Design an enzyme around this catalytic site. Structure first.
Site, PDB file in Angstrom:
ATOM      1  N   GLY B  29       0.823  -1.215   0.000  1.00 16.17           N
ATOM      2  CA  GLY B  29       0.000   0.000   0.000  1.00 16.17           C
ATOM      3  C   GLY B  29       0.851   1.257   0.000  1.00 16.17           C
ATOM      4  O   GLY B  29       1.960   1.295  -0.623  1.00 16.17           O
ATOM      5  N   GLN B  31       2.691   2.853   2.178  1.00 22.09           N
ATOM      6  CA  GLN B  31       4.079   2.665   2.670  1.00 22.09           C
ATOM      7  C   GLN B  31       4.747   1.469   1.976  1.00 22.09           C
ATOM      8  O   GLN B  31       5.884   1.619   1.513  1.00 22.09           O
ATOM      9  CB  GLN B  31       4.088   2.533   4.193  1.00 22.09           C
ATOM     10  CG  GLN B  31       3.769   3.845   4.893  1.00 22.09           C
ATOM     11  CD  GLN B  31       4.826   4.893   4.618  1.00 22.09           C
ATOM     12  OE1 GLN B  31       6.021   4.600   4.590  1.00 22.09           O
ATOM     13  NE2 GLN B  31       4.400   6.124   4.378  1.00 22.09           N
ATOM     14  N   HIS B 110       4.448   2.122  12.847  1.00 22.99           N
ATOM     15  CA  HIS B 110       3.560   2.855  13.782  1.00 22.99           C
ATOM     16  C   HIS B 110       3.506   2.051  15.075  1.00 22.99           C
ATOM     17  O   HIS B 110       3.444   0.812  14.997  1.00 22.99           O
ATOM     18  CB  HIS B 110       2.171   3.041  13.140  1.00 22.99           C
ATOM     19  CG  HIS B 110       1.141   3.807  13.925  1.00 22.99           C
ATOM     20  ND1 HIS B 110       1.410   4.956  14.672  1.00 22.99           N
ATOM     21  CD2 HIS B 110      -0.212   3.687  13.927  1.00 22.99           C
ATOM     22  CE1 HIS B 110       0.271   5.436  15.153  1.00 22.99           C
ATOM     23  NE2 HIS B 110      -0.734   4.669  14.717  1.00 22.99           N
ATOM     24  N   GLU B 228      -8.491  30.838  -3.092  1.00 23.83           N
ATOM     25  CA  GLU B 228      -7.693  31.566  -2.074  1.00 23.83           C
ATOM     26  C   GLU B 228      -7.491  30.680  -0.848  1.00 23.83           C
ATOM     27  O   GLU B 228      -6.409  30.739  -0.259  1.00 23.83           O
ATOM     28  CB  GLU B 228      -8.365  32.870  -1.683  1.00 23.83           C
ATOM     29  CG  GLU B 228      -8.468  33.819  -2.854  1.00 23.83           C
ATOM     30  CD  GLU B 228      -7.134  34.110  -3.506  1.00 23.83           C
ATOM     31  OE1 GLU B 228      -6.264  34.681  -2.820  1.00 23.83           O
ATOM     32  OE2 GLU B 228      -6.960  33.726  -4.675  1.00 23.83           O
TER      33      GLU B 228
HETATM   34  N1  LIG Z   1      -0.063   6.053   5.014  1.00 20.48           N
HETATM   35  C1  LIG Z   1       1.088   6.568   5.440  1.00 20.48           C
HETATM   36  O1  LIG Z   1       1.626   7.518   4.859  1.00 20.48           O
HETATM   37  C2  LIG Z   1       1.770   6.023   6.627  1.00 20.48           C
HETATM   38  C3  LIG Z   1       2.946   6.734   7.166  1.00 20.48           C
HETATM   39  C4  LIG Z   1       3.626   6.091   8.279  1.00 20.48           C
HETATM   40  C5  LIG Z   1       3.124   5.028   8.851  1.00 20.48           C
HETATM   41  N2  LIG Z   1       2.081   4.328   8.288  1.00 20.48           N
HETATM   42  C6  LIG Z   1       1.834   2.950   8.799  1.00 20.48           C
HETATM   43  O2  LIG Z   1       2.181   2.051   7.777  1.00 20.48           O
HETATM   44  C7  LIG Z   1       1.389   0.845   7.887  1.00 20.48           C
HETATM   45  C8  LIG Z   1       0.725   0.593   6.555  1.00 20.48           C
HETATM   46  O3  LIG Z   1      -0.189   1.682   6.318  1.00 20.48           O
HETATM   47  P1  LIG Z   1      -0.597   2.179   4.848  1.00 20.48           P
HETATM   48  O4  LIG Z   1      -1.088   3.581   4.974  1.00 20.48           O
HETATM   49  O5  LIG Z   1       0.474   1.871   3.861  1.00 20.48           O
HETATM   50  O6  LIG Z   1      -1.866   1.242   4.550  1.00 20.48           O
HETATM   51  P2  LIG Z   1      -2.736   0.888   3.258  1.00 20.48           P
HETATM   52  O7  LIG Z   1      -4.164   1.163   3.556  1.00 20.48           O
HETATM   53  O8  LIG Z   1      -2.142   1.518   2.049  1.00 20.48           O
HETATM   54  O9  LIG Z   1      -2.475  -0.676   3.256  1.00 20.48           O
HETATM   55  C9  LIG Z   1      -2.922  -1.474   2.165  1.00 20.48           C
HETATM   56  C10 LIG Z   1      -2.104  -2.739   2.193  1.00 20.48           C
HETATM   57  O10 LIG Z   1      -2.483  -3.514   3.359  1.00 20.48           O
HETATM   58  C11 LIG Z   1      -2.940  -4.782   2.952  1.00 20.48           C
HETATM   59  N3  LIG Z   1      -4.020  -5.208   3.832  1.00 20.48           N
HETATM   60  C12 LIG Z   1      -5.182  -4.544   4.119  1.00 20.48           C
HETATM   61  N4  LIG Z   1      -5.947  -5.191   4.964  1.00 20.48           N
HETATM   62  C13 LIG Z   1      -5.252  -6.352   5.257  1.00 20.48           C
HETATM   63  C14 LIG Z   1      -5.535  -7.461   6.080  1.00 20.48           C
HETATM   64  N5  LIG Z   1      -6.646  -7.593   6.800  1.00 20.48           N
HETATM   65  N6  LIG Z   1      -4.611  -8.452   6.132  1.00 20.48           N
HETATM   66  C15 LIG Z   1      -3.492  -8.321   5.406  1.00 20.48           C
HETATM   67  N7  LIG Z   1      -3.126  -7.330   4.597  1.00 20.48           N
HETATM   68  C16 LIG Z   1      -4.051  -6.362   4.574  1.00 20.48           C
HETATM   69  C17 LIG Z   1      -3.359  -4.632   1.496  1.00 20.48           C
HETATM   70  O11 LIG Z   1      -3.303  -5.853   0.805  1.00 20.48           O
HETATM   71  C18 LIG Z   1      -2.282  -3.674   0.998  1.00 20.48           C
HETATM   72  O12 LIG Z   1      -1.056  -4.336   0.702  1.00 20.48           O
HETATM   73  C19 LIG Z   1       0.466   1.084   9.091  1.00 20.48           C
HETATM   74  O13 LIG Z   1       1.089   0.556  10.258  1.00 20.48           O
HETATM   75  C20 LIG Z   1       0.398   2.610   9.149  1.00 20.48           C
HETATM   76  O14 LIG Z   1       0.071   3.106  10.434  1.00 20.48           O
HETATM   77  C21 LIG Z   1       1.369   4.856   7.240  1.00 20.48           C
HETATM   78 MG   LIG Z   2      -0.493   7.292  11.206  1.00 17.07          MG
HETATM   79 MG   LIG Z   3      -2.566  37.295  -2.714  1.00 17.35          MG
END
Ligand SMILES: NC(=O)c1ccc[n+]([C@@H]2O[C@H](COP(=O)([O-])OP(=O)(O)OC[C@H]3O[C@@H](n4cnc5c(N)ncnc54)[C@H](O)[C@@H]3O)[C@@H](O)[C@H]2O)c1
Ligand SMILES: [Mg+2]
Ligand SMILES: [Mg+2]
Ligand SMILES: NC(=O)c1ccc[n+]([C@@H]2O[C@H](COP(=O)([O-])OP(=O)(O)OC[C@H]3O[C@@H](n4cnc5c(N)ncnc54)[C@H](O)[C@@H]3O)[C@@H](O)[C@H]2O)c1
Ligand SMILES: O=C(O)/C=C(\O)C(=O)O
Ligand SMILES: O=C(O)/C=C(\O)C(=O)O
Ligand SMILES: [Mg+2]
Ligand SMILES: [Mg+2]
Lengths: 339, 342
Positions: B29, B31, B110, B228
Site C-alpha cells: 500500500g 508505505q 507505527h 484563495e
Molecule cells: N499512510 C502513510 O503515509 C503512513 C505513514 C507512516 C506510517 N504508516 C503505517 O504504515 C502501515 C501501513 O499503512 P498504509 O497507509 O500503507 O496502509 P494501506 O491502507 O495503504 O495498506 C494497504 C495494504 O495492506 C494490505 N491489507 C489490508 N488489509 C489487510 C488485512 N486484513 N490483512 C493483510 N493485509 C491487509 C493490502 O493488501 C495492501 O497491501 C500502518 O502501520 C500505518 O500506520 C502509514
Molecule cells: Mg499514522
Molecule cells: Mg494574494
C-alpha cells in the site's frame, strides 16, 4: 457566469513592437521581468535607488529610475508596495504615461482607495496573481503557471483586455487560468486570506506544538508533526490538485482516515467563524486600510518589531533546532531569474 | 533537553548489515510500495507478502517476487509489517510469528499494535519501529531526487544485538537517513501520530472550509474563494516552504508589506481558548484507549462507516466547489506513471 482565459484565449501578438516597463523588482517584479524576457517581450525595469535596482542590473535588465522607465513604455506594471502607489503614481507615472498606454496593478487596494485612478487617453487594469514569485518562476520554466484574476478598469484604446491577457500569457498565468474578478472584490478577498486564513493556519500549527510540549512530548517531534516534516504542507498542496478530504482517502492509512473523520467538521468553536466575519468587516469598511497607512510610518517600523519578535517565539526557536538537525529537501535557487 | 536527541543521518548508517539478506515487505500500500521500490533500487533483495487483492497484482505488475504473507516471512531475514494497524494482531499470530526465522527482525511503521499488545517480542528475534513522517509518493519522489523524509525509530527487542544497525540500514536504503532518523519510543510515536491525524489535520481542513463558507456567505465568487483558501496552491506552498525556513519567515520573505502588516495584525490572536481545550480532549481520547476502542469498532465490516464518511465528505460545498475549480483551472502536476518501477 465566469470568464476564464487559458492559453487558447490569449496570444503574444498584442505585445509585438511594444515595451513593458516593470516598476519594481521585488517578489512579483522580478518574476514578471524574467518571464516577460524569456517569452520574447521587450522589457525594462524602473526602480528607486535600493538593492533591487542593483539586483535587476546584475540579472541583465535595462534599469532606470521609474519616470524614465514609464516614458519609454507602452505597458507599465506597478509592482511596488501598495501604500507607495499614490506618491509614485502622481509624481513618476501619471506625468510620463504615453497616450494609449496601459497601466496595470497586481492588487486592487490602490484602486479602491483612489491612490491610482483612470487617466484620460490611457488604459487601466488589474492583473492579480494568486501565488508568490519563486513558484511563478519555477512553474514558468516547467511550462506551467499559477492562476490570476483580472479587471479592465478603463479602456480608452478598446485594446486593454487583449493587452492585459497577452501580459498574463507571457508571464504564464493563462497556463492555469485568468478569471475576471472586480478589483474591489479582489482587494477584500486577498486581504481576508492574509489577515484571517494565513494567521489562523499558523496559530493552529503553533497551538498543536504548544499542547504537545505541555503534554510532555519531544519538542523536535512535535515541531516535525505540526509542519516541520513537510507532511501538513504536502497534504495542503496535494489537496489543491485532488481535494483535501480526497488526499486523506488516498494517502491515509485506515487508522489515519478513521481518526480524521472522527473530528472532521467538529474541531472549531463558533468564535472562529465570528472572528473571520470581524476581520472581513475591518477589510470591507476601511479599518484595515487606515491601519496599513499608520503602519507604513517610518518605513514600517512596527512591522520590523513584529517580525523580530516572531522569530523569538518557541515555535521558531524549535524550528531552528529541527532544521539544523534534519535535512529538508531543497532545489538550488541561484540564477533562477537569469535568462 | 534538545541536547539528548539521537538523530541518525547517512554518516551514521550503512547498507553493510543487509549484505546477503532478504527483506519481506508485508503489504504493498501507501508505505509498502515505497519501501519495496526504494529497497530494490538501493540493491537490497526484497520480496512482497500480500493477501489476495489488487495490491498483490500491482506488486506483480511492478516486477516484484509476490507470495502470500506466510511464505514471504519464511524466506526473510527482515520483515516490514506495512498493512493497516487493526489487521496486525491476526496476521502476526497466524502468518508472521510461526514463520519468523531465528534471529530475524520484525519492524512496524507505527507504535499502535505494540501499545495494544497485538504485536509482541518473540524469544530469539528482534522487534523494532521505523515510522516515516511522510506518505509514500513523496518518499518515492524524494528517493529518486537523492532526498528523503524524516522517520522515528525504537528498538523494542534486540536478541541478536544487531537490531539497531539493521533498522538503520533499512532506513538508509529507503532514504530516511537523508533527512534524519530520530530515536522516539513507540508509545510516544503512537500518541503523537494519532494527534496529528485527529486534531491538527481535521482542524486545518475545518479552518480552510470556514474561510470558504464565510466568503461564499458574504457574496464572494465561490471559485475565487476556493482558490484563495487552498485551491491556488498558495496556502500549501506557504506551509511546505515554511517546513524549510519557518512559517513566520515565509511571510517576511514572500509577503508584500500589505500582506505582512495584515498577517501580524492577527498572528497569535485568531484562536479562542476552546481550540487548545479541544486539542487536549483529543489527546485524552488517544492516551486513554478511547480512540483505540473506536478504531476497533470502525474496522467492522471492512470499515463500512468510513465508506459512508468518505462519500458524505465529497458532497460538502467545499468539495463540490473543488470539482468546479479543478475543471476550470489547470493545476501543475508531474507525470506519476511508472514512479514505482525499477
Ligand atoms: N499512510 C502513510 O503515509 C503512513 C505513514 C507512516 C506510517 N504508516 C503505517 O504504515 C502501515 C501501513 O499503512 P498504509 O497507509 O500503507 O496502509 P494501506 O491502507 O495503504 O495498506 C494497504 C495494504 O495492506 C494490505 N491489507 C489490508 N488489509 C489487510 C488485512 N486484513 N490483512 C493483510 N493485509 C491487509 C493490502 O493488501 C495492501 O497491501 C500502518 O502501520 C500505518 O500506520 C502509514
Ligand atoms: Mg499514522
Ligand atoms: Mg494574494
Ligand atoms: N508578494 C506577492 O506574492 C504578491 C502576489 C500578488 C500581488 N502582489 C502585489 O504586487 C505588488 C508588489 O508587491 P511585492 O510583494 O512584489 O512587493 P515587494 O515588497 O517585494 O516590493 C519591493 C519592490 O518595491 C520597491 N519599492 C519599495 N518601496 C518603494 C517606494 N516607496 N517607492 C518605490 N518603489 C518602492 C522596491 O524598490 C522593490 O523593487 C503589490 O501591489 C502587491 O500587493 C504581491
Ligand atoms: O505520516 C503519514 O504521512 C501518514 C500516517 O501516519 C498514516 O496514514 O497513518
Ligand atoms: O498572493 C500572494 O501570494 C501574496 C500577496 O497577495 C501579497 O503578498 O500581498
Ligand atoms: Mg504519520
Ligand atoms: Mg496581497
Amino acid at each position: 457566469n465566469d470568464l476564464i482565459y487559458q492559453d487558447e484565449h490569449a496570444s503574444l501578438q498584442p505585445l509585438e513592437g511594444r515595451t513593458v516597463a516593470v516598476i519594481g523588482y521585488g517578489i512579483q517584479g522580478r518574476a514578471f521581468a524574467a518571464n516577460l524576457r524569456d517569452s520574447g517581450v521587450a522589457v525594462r525595469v524602473g526602480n528607486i535607488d535600493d538593492r533591487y535596482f542593483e539586483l535587476a542590473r546584475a540579472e541583465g535588465h535595462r534599469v532606470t529610475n521609474i519616470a524614465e522607465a514609464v516614458a519609454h513604455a507602452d505597458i507599465v506594471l506597478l509592482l511596488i508596495p501598495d501604500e507607495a502607489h499614490g506618491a509614485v503614481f502622481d509624481v513618476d507615472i501619471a506625468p510620463n504615461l504615453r497616450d494609449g498606454a496601459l497601466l496595470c496593478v497586481a492588487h486592487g487596494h490602490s484602486l479602491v482607495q483612489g491612490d491610482v485612478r483612470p487617466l484620460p487617453g490611457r488604459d487601466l487594469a488589474m492583473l492579480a496573481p494568486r501565488m508568490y514569485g519563486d513558484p511563478i518562476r519555477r512553474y514558468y520554466l516547467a511550462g506551467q503557471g499559477a492562476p490570476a484574476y483580472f479587471d479592465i478598469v478603463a479602456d480608452h484604446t478598446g485594446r486593454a483586455r487583449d493587452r492585459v491577457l497577452a501580459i498574463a500569457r507571457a508571464v504564464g498565468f493563462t497556463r492555469a487560468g485568468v478569471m475576471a474578478l472586480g478589483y474591489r472584490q479582489e482587494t477584500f478577498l486577498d486581504l481576508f486570506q492574509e489577515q484571517f486564513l494565513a494567521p489562523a493556519l499558523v496559530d493552529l500549527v503553533e497551538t498543536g506544538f504548544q499542547v504537545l510540549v505541555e503534554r510532555g512530548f519531544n519538542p523536535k517531534a512535535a515541531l516535525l508533526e505540526v509542519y516541520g516534516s513537510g507532511q501538513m504542507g504536502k497534504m495542503m498542496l496535494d489537496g489543491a490538485d485532488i481535494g483535501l478530504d480526497e488526499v486523506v482517502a488516498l494517502q491515509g492509512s485506515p487508522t489515519c482516515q478513521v481518526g480524521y473523520h472522527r473530528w472532521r467538521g467538529r474541531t472549531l468553536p463558533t468564535a472562529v467563524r465570528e472572528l473571520a466575519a470581524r476581520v472581513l468587516d475591518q477589510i470591507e469598511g476601511g479599518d484595515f486600510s487606515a491601519y496599513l497607512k499608520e503602519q507604513a510610518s517610518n518605513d514600517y517600523a512596527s512591522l520590523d518589531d513584529a517580525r523580530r519578535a516572531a522569530l523569538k517565539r518557541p515555535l521558531n526557536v524549535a524550528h531552528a533546532q529541527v532544521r539544523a538537525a534534519f535535512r529538508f529537501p531543497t532545489e538550488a535557487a541561484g540564477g533562477l531569474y537569469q535568462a
